């Protein structure tokens, strides 16, 4: 009975710290590190600013609200504080959207990966969503546009213990496509053709960049061989000048045993060639390669990179298989190699591939895709637990009280604990990960 309220009581105020916690710990991660400080984490700055404000300026008095059974706050606060909630979510969904906007030009540009923008004007473009926003949620509002004009509405507008958010039809379809659905919509299409051109820059640099990883210095592989870039041997000479030398004759220049990464993507495309022109002609391996499409090309030639040419030879039946396209029966037999045996994980994907022949075994591998991933969440967390609560809004503008108010409420209520998730999700970051953990005094 009253037992409850206090239990409820205890739930909320969690729910307040969790949000308060946590959105503090995102904006001090990214303002301390300099290494998070991104044109990206600059939005989620603005995210976690408006969770934030939800934290502090909308949630207690809600919470308040529902456990005192009435408004205790005057009809200035209501106004206000009604405000600050439109203002917040209006802002984050926007910030969302801009999000998704800015990693779309960002991997479609020459430059990959980095945004359009410096520093400064995505600062400015912050500023101006919040205006925006403003104007958005605070003009209508306060200028008592949003207001219902029957008699009950009257009733709790006049009354300085009712704070109900009664509104006219104009303004809840208005406010709601405009604010929630204009942005959400573009976020939503925008980030999928995000994901669709970070699954199309998957290829045969990128699978072996995976499976057999890309060093910038000089390193000795297994057999103690001097080795560079993606398992690139430079000399047998135990010499490592010689090596050097090797090295600096490939790339162009002095290298003193350092490379860039598109280097090294400049001698694995070398490679790739040579291991192609082998592959040709390998009696055992052409008609193979001759037979198999460009992606199950890119696993044999993986399989050669990492065995040799007289290693892939050896599976008989499992080539046999593969060119007569009985992937399933050549994936039993490769599963019984030494090579399944030893690396069974790389082992696991270029099989896969042979079976799929797509790159679906390469997907959310590379760092960077990881982080389109997190940012993928993020936006769909925010749907999940508010287009429930914004689809009852236009439901009860075609056909009013269909939905219990207990229930809009609750509805309202995923919404709001929806700003103590972000922090959570960005514990998929390395970065933010460790950032954390620094600050926790951990
Ligand atoms: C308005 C009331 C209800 C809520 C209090 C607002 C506070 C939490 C908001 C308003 C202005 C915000 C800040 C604005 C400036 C930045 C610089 C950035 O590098 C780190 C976050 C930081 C420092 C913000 C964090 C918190 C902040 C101070
Ligand atoms: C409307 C009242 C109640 C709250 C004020 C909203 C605050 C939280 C908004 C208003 C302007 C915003 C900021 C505008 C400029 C930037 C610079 C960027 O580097 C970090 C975020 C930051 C700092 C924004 C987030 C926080 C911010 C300060
Ligand atoms: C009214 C309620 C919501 C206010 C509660 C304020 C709490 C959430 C604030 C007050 C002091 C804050 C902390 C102060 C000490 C640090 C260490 C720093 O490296 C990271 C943030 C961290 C861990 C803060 C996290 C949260 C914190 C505990
Ligand atoms: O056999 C052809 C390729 O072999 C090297 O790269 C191998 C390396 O021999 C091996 O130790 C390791 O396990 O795998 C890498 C690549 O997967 C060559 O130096 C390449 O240039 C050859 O194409
Ligand atoms: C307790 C109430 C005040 N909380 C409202 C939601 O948190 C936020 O709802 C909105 C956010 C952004 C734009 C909006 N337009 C609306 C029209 C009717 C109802 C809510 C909204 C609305
Ligand atoms: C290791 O970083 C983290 C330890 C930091 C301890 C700081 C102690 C903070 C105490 C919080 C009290 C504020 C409560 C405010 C209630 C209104």
């Not at 004007?121 to 403003?134: C, F, N, P, Y």
């Not at 044999?300 to 040799?308: D, E, Y």
């Not at 994907?349 to 982080?371: Q, S």
């Amino acid at each position: 009975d009253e037992v409850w309220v206090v239990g409820m009581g205890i739930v909320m105020s969690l729910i307040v710290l969790a949000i308060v916690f946590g959105n503090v710990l995102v904006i001090t991660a990214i303002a301390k590190f300099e290494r998070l400080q991104t044109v990206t984490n600059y939005f989620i700055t603005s995210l976690a600013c408006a969770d934030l404000v939800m934290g502090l300026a909308v949630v207690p008095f809600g919470a308040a609200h529902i456990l005192m059974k009435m408004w205790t706050f005057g009809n200035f606060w209501c106004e206000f504080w009604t405000s600050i909630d439109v203002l917040c979510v209006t802002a984050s969904i926007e910030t969302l959207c801009v999000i998704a906007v800015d990693r779309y030009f960002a991997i479609t540009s020459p430059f990959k990966y980095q945004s359009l923008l410096t520093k400064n004007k995505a600062r400015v473009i912050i500023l101006m969503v919040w205006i925006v926003s403003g104007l958005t949620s605070f003009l209508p509002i306060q200028m008592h546009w949003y207001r219902a004009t029957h008699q009950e509405a009257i009733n709790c507008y006049a009354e300085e213990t009712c704070c109900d958010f009664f509104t006219n039809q104009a303004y809840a379809i208005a406010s709601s496509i405009v604010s929630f659905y204009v942005p959400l919509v573009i976020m939503v299409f925008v980030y999928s053709r995000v994901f669709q051109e970070a699954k199309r820059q998957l290829n045969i640099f990128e699978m072996l960049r995976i499976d057999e990883g890309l060093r910038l210095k000089i390193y000795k592989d297994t057999e103690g061989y001097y080795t560079i870039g993606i398992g690139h041997l430079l000399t047998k000479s135990p010499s490592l000048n010689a090596a050097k030398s090797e090295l600096d004759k490939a790339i162009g220049r002095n290298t003193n045993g350092v490379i860039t990464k598109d280097e090294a993507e400049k001698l694995f495309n070398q490679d790739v060639d040579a291991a192609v022109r082998g592959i040709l002609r390998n009696a055992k391996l052409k008609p193979v390669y001759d037979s198999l499409d460009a992606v199950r090309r890119a696993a044999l030639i993986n399989m050669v990179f990492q065995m040799g040419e007289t290693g892939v030879a050896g599976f008989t039946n499992s080539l046999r298989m593969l060119q007569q396209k009985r992937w399933d029966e050549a994936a039993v037999n490769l599963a019984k190699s030494r090579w399944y045996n030893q690396t069974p994980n790389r082992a696991k994907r270029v099989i896969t591939t042979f079976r799929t022949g797509t790159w679906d075994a390469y997907k959310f591998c590379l760092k960077e895709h990881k982080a389109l991933k997190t940012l993928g969440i993020i936006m769909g967390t925010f749907t999940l637990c508010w287009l429930p609560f914004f689809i009852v809004n236009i439901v009860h503008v075609i056909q009013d009280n269909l939905i219990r108010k207990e229930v809009y409420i609750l509805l309202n209520w995923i919404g709001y604990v929806n700003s103590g998730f972000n922090p959570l999700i960005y514990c998929r970051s390395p970065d933010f990960r460790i950032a954390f953990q620094e600050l926790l005094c951990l």
